[PDB]
Amino acid sequence: SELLVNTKSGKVMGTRVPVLSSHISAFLGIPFAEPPVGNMRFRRPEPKKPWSGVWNASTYPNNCQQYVDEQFPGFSGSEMWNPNREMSEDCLYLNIWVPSPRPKSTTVMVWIYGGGFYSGSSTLDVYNGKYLAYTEEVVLVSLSYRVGAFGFLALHGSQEAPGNVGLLDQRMALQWVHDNIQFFGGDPKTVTIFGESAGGASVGMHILSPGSRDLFRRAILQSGSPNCPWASVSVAEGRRRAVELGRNLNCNLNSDEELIHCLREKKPQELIDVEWNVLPFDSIFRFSFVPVIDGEFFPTSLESMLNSGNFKKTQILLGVNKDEGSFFLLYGAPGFSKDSESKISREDFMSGVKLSVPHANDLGLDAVTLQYTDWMDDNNGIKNRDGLDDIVGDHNVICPLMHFVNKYTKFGNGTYLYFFNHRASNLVWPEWMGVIHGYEIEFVFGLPLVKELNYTAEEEALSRRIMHYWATFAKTGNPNEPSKWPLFTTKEQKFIDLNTEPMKVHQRLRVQMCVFWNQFLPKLLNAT
Amino acid sequence: SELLVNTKSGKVMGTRVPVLSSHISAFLGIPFAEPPVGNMRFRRPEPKKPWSGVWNASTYPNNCQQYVDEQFPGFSGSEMWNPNREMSEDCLYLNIWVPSPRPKSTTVMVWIYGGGFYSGSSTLDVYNGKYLAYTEEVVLVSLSYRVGAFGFLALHGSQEAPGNVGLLDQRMALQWVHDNIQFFGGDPKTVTIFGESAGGASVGMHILSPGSRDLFRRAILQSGSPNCPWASVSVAEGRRRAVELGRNLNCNLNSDEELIHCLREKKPQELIDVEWNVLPFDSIFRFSFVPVIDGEFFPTSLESMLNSGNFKKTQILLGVNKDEGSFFLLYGAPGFSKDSESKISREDFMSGVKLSVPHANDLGLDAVTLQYTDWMDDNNGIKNRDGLDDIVGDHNVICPLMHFVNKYTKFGNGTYLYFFNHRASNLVWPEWMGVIHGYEIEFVFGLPLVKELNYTAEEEALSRRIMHYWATFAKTGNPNEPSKWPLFTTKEQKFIDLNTEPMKVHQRLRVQMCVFWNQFLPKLLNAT
Numbered sequence A, B: 001s002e003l004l005v006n007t008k009s010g011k012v013m014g015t016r017v018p019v020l021s022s023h024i025s026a027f028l029g030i031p032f033a034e035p036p037v038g039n040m041r042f043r044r045p046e047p048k049k050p051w052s053g054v055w056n057a058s059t060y061p062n063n064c065q066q067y068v069d070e071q072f073p074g075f076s077g078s079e080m081w082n083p084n085r086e087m088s089e090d091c092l093y094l095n096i097w098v099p100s101p102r103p104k105s106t107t108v109m110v111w112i113y114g115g116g117f118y119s120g121s122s123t124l125d126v127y128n129g130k131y132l133a134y135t136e137e138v139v140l141v142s143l144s145y146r147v148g149a150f151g152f153l154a155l156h157g158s159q160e161a162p163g164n165v166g167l168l169d170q171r172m173a174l175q176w177v178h179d180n181i182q183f184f185g186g187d188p189k190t191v192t193i194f195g196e197s198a199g200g201a202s203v204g205m206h207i208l209s210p211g212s213r214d215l216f217r218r219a220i221l222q223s224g225s226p227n228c229p230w231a232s233v234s235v236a237e238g239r240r241r242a243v244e245l246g247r248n249l250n251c252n253l254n255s256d257e258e259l260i261h262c263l264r265e266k267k268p269q270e271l272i273d274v275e276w277n278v279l280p281f282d283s284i285f286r287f288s289f290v291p292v293i294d295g296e297f298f299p300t301s302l303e304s305m306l307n308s309g310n311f312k313k314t315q316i317l318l319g320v321n322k323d324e325g326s327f328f329l330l331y332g333a334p335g336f337s338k339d340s341e342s343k344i345s346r347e348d349f350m351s352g353v354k355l356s357v358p359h360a361n362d363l364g365l366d367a368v369t370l371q372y373t374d375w376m377d378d379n380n381g382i383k384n385r386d387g388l389d390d391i392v393g394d395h396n397v398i399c400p401l402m403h404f405v406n407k408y409t410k411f412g413n414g415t416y417l418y419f420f421n422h423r424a425s426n427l428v429w430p431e432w433m434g435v436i437h438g439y440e441i442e443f444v445f446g447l448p449l450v451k452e453l454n455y456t457a458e459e460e461a462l463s464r465r466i467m468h469y470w471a472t473f474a475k476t477g478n479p480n481e482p483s484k485w486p487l488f489t490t491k492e493q494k495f496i497d498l499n500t501e502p503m504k505v506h507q508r509l510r511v512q513m514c515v516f517w518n519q520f521l522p523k524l525l526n527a528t
């Protein structure tokens, strides 16, 4: 049977699903690790023990325990990101969509969800892999990994909560794909890992980590990169946050063992209830438990690894959206709200910059403020709002990505860069938010091909070329079919806009602002 | 003309090639069998029909259809093993390097490539025979043979895909050398067949097979022997895999004729795409289509043939490398990777032993684990990594070879044993891999004599003594020129280390571990 597959872990039985008036097989909820519960909470993942009998992979698995967004109850704009299954610490599963008839040995794509390392689910409707698997004939995999304290509580030195375990969950699912995807018709020598936001940062982290490099072929990074300011912390900062988490739950803090034991007796929701209290600064776009530069998963600092070419050399395709920062301001900065145009006073602009570059002294805050203010029109509310939006996006996503791409390209085997600036016709978020962080995903997963979702015909056409670019790149290392997306090179630095207009090629994506964020401000904060 | 040679099959025209500031003649691509295409796929080879006119033997022939390594695109360490010519089922050719001026009747050496019986090419740069032909004045021949399903699909009972045809390809090239090498100045009564890994196992198979014995004089086996656990299967297992291959390609499986007809209509790459899906166990160092103990090429089981002295009696020179197993763990076991020191956890060690002795029950896995674990330091990552490396190498190469050599020596006419443990100064593979499977070949073929390859002067000197040992042994049955490599005897069991230090003689190569693999574990698995 087409729905029965024999893996090295045991037999698994899928389910047939309809897609654009046709059908494909889906194997939902395949376990790849032992449930990280009880004493295994905070520990490195262990491989799933093989099972006898047939594993029912006909329904989505649980989502990992995470903070749930309740800012706009029932608003589809925000709820489409929340867990749509019951949450459970027993959440280490992967999902596979396989073309029908079963391919023999085709291109594989593995999706790694984002969510700032504190949330995310592989089961969301925008991540439904049937459209891409079907339209491009690829075997599409989506994995899961522990987030929040469960995935990233870090007490360096302890083997009980070493940190980075959520990245080790990702690695284990990739080990499983490498080892078993051939039975589903996937080619283990042609797997592309791709992800957005924290998922894109994760993809970049597996490209850097010696221990993950051999498990995949190529990579796609969407609005995220490994060196993002919110994507990692030192082992000392990770320790300080773990201790502060324990302090919030009245834990004995005399030894790592005492702290970890206490944290393990707490119900999941007790950890999530105080998670946000450990941030060191009043800040925006900062998450509590994220990867740690531990000397193992990351052998040295991310920057020296980038400088010395200490990373997987292959092809990469990556890019950013026009208004990466808007939703972080909506959710966390004074003066911004969902139902108003959010014109910002100079006072709110300034408290907004303080929130956006939490680690800066007064001189640094003045350098950012000057760089983003039009002094011939300083009380223009629209300009203040847009300037703040760009500050958040440039500092947190764009400039870190541009720095990663220029460092990568020097040693890599091929780079394709994009700038996604299409505002969807059916967007439910207000206009001031522009092309929002996460909104290129629906085009990557082909949602505009389904009539009921109400996209325009040109949006469907855009979705189809993006999917074909992503799959063609996954298959060959080049998004182009033998109008050209030019290669990004050290010298030329070309990239394309990705929207409904005829392709335009440009150069040096946000160079002006990124020289400020990647060279000047850091020098400024280091001297003062 | 020195480049024109008249053989029993027709005239062939060679090409003059430069070597170490001198020159020799090369006759590349001489056909020895009819192309095994169309309805001849899976069939025994047929002798090449003589041709009129002159055969252009100035360029390398195609390589046989095989799985291609893409784990490290462009890495020279791995690509030096991949086909460097176009692949084609039309691949049955041999290559000859002849000293200049043309010898009258000199020592002949025939190289049989390895590659686990699923890959390999006679045209690789490490197999360039000009250095050895030139430096030692031998006529050097390299043959080819079908690998993968093309060479070893076995449906015992059928004459259409009887199995072992790849070994019959080897035999036919040897028949051709026996019959025609005199015209190239070679002495047909003094031919030494030599090969590495599956090539060394093949050499041992022609020593056992009654039908191949009279076609050569002496033999050299490098890191491989006929009784290796991965080198053969029963006719029942061969049948089960052929049927499973057919099942993977939606073949009618009602009769051998139906299955074979279906398999013959498939394009080469369709067979290679699913080849790895027929292995019975999750395993490492196991290949899908290998020789079958069929009652014809091998009259009875390999072990009873060894026990009863049913094999060619002559002299043999053979040996092993220090870390035969490392690359198989890199490529197939969790926790190992090219760019890290690969320190293994106890968990990865254990899943590694399961993968390495696929055919063992739990008690057997416990016996291997206990034998290779230092219990005073069980979490030592380096020790776990090295222990696993030794398990793979001892079980797959060393102990099978030691068993073959002790059985052979009882009836043979002279044995010389070696242990190659020199790690090359210019090795591109990480340190943890040690003296890798296949890395003595470059010394046997004299690559260190070419300055541009960057070896040390002592490496050049080592290469020169190995080449002179191999050629002197091929010419006389003794590697020594009238410091001595002592004869391996039943009583003394002496062998030498082969490296840049002064020769040291030792005894009983890995006896302790090999008594475990050759006597205890098999008894254990047979009783339980």
Ligand SMILES: O=c1ccc2c([nH]1)CCC[C@H]2NCCCCCCCCCCNc1c2c(nc3ccccc13)CCCC2
Pocket: A069, A077, A078, A081, A114, A115, A116, A196, A197, A276, A279, A282, A283, A327, A328, A331, A332, A436, A437, A438, A439
């Ligand atoms: O001092 C502090 C700092 C923060 C906070 C507190 N105290 C107290 C508790 C509330 C917490 N605030 C809730 C913030 C949660 C994280 C900020 C981001 C808003 C929620 C994002 C959820 N999901 C989205 C995701 C993506 N795009 C989106 C776009 C629009 C709206 C929501 C999106 C892209 C993929 C990742 C998830």
Ligand SMILES: O=c1ccc2c([nH]1)CCC[C@H]2NCCCCCCCCCCNc1c2c(nc3ccccc13)CCCC2
Pocket: A182, A188, B069, B077, B078, B081, B114, B115, B116, B196, B197, B276, B279, B282, B283, B327, B328, B331, B332, B436, B437, B438, B439
């Ligand atoms: O369940 C399974 C088991 C295996 C596999 C799959 N599924 C799915 C497909 C991939 C296949 N894995 C690829 C394995 C290929 C064979 C394992 C060995 C690695 C490739 C060896 C290629 N060439 C080499 C050869 C030699 N020495 C070498 C040394 C270092 C690196 C490569 C070397 C010595 C001569 C023979 C070839």
Ligand SMILES: *[C@@H]1O[C@H](CO)[C@@H](O)[C@H](O)[C@H]1NC(C)=O
Pocket: A056, A058, A059
């Ligand atoms: C798999 O689970 C679903 C719902 O949990 C159920 O409808 C279906 O019958 C199950 N299949 C089998 C054979 O257990």
Ligand SMILES: *[C@@H]1O[C@H](CO)[C@@H](O)[C@H](O)[C@H]1NC(C)=O
Pocket: A412, A413, A414, A415, B073, B074
């Ligand atoms: C990628 O590598 C191959 C060989 O290693 C080389 O021929 C090709 O030019 C490289 N491409 C780029 C964009 O560096």
Ligand SMILES: *[C@@H]1O[C@H](CO)[C@@H](O)[C@H](O)[C@H]1NC(C)=O
Pocket: B056, B058, B059
């Ligand atoms: C032999 O073939 C090579 C290339 O295919 C060519 O350069 C050479 O001229 C050929 N020799 C003859 C006489 O056909």
Ligand SMILES: *[C@@H]1O[C@H](CO)[C@@H](O)[C@H](O)[C@H]1NC(C)=O
Pocket: B412, B413, B414, B415
């Ligand atoms: C090899 O055989 C010859 C004669 O058959 C004999 O004189 C010689 O001693 C033998 N050598 C060995 C090592 O058995």
